[PDB]
């Protein structure tokens, strides 16, 4: 019980819980494993939102973005906008699913781009209260991050709880990925973790090498989050969704 999540490269990014919290295990956090001490500590995403607000005049941003009926708080933290002593922490773009304890995002090393091998995607959320129905259907409004803090992928995912399948496609402009389609993404009915394959289209053409991993979160599966990794790392994407 507590924070669950996945990173596409644990040499660069690990997810966990913020230490010394009022809710041990309940505050989603991220560690830049690519950095040495003291830059590799686990920092709560909530604190990173605060930094993205605090450095806004220098080029970071924190914005409540509406996608249909849902709000996704987006934090954009490029190395170029942060003081030199923060260069080892690298570049972040991440989102929060509403006010739920569910975060999803990406990272890459200082001096790299999202096309570089260090492009890493992750999600993190509190599993403590998660339950998933064993029957019926629901839809989610989903936002995706792919190499940008200003242009998001968006779409609707459909959860078939009786069949144990998650289906749908995200689309967007201004990112390497133009469309991302779940292929056989599935879960045991009544359980939270899902995985499968994916196909992206975009500025490099079709890439069907995608592997998707994620999970439902919250009472009655009020949210979901996950990652999609491809042979072409510029297509690596993190996503989060709120149940409609």
Author numbering: 21 to 264
Task: Please give sentences taken from the publication describing this entry.
HphA is composed of a C-terminal 8-stranded β-barrel packed against an N-terminal clamp-like structure through 6 intermediate β-strands. Once secreted, HphA has the dual capacity of binding hemoglobin and scavenging heme. HphA along with its cognate receptor, HphR, function together as a two-component receptor required for full virulence and facilitating extrapulmonary dissemination and/or survival in the blood.
To examine the heme-binding potential of HphA, acid-acetone extraction was used to strip the co-purifying heme. The resulting apo protein is devoid of heme and refolds to its native conformation as indicated by the absence of a Soret signature in the UV–Vis spectra and X-ray crystal structures. Comparison of holo and apo structures reveals that the loop containing H43 undergoes a large conformational change upon heme binding and release, while the 310 helix containing H106 is only slightly displaced. Apo HphA interacts specifically with hemoglobin conjugated to agarose beads as evidenced by pull-down. Purified apo HphA does not support growth of HsmA, HphA, or HphR mutants, but rescues growth of the HsmA and HphA mutant in combination with hemoglobin as the heme source. Based on the pull-down results, we propose that apo HphA binds to Hb largely through its heme-Fe coordination residues, H43 and H106. This mode of binding is plausible as the loop containing H43 is flexible and could wedge itself into the heme-binding site, positioning HphA to capture spontaneously released heme using H106 in a relatively quick step. The loop containing H43 then dissociates from Hb and clamps down on heme in a relatively slower binding step.
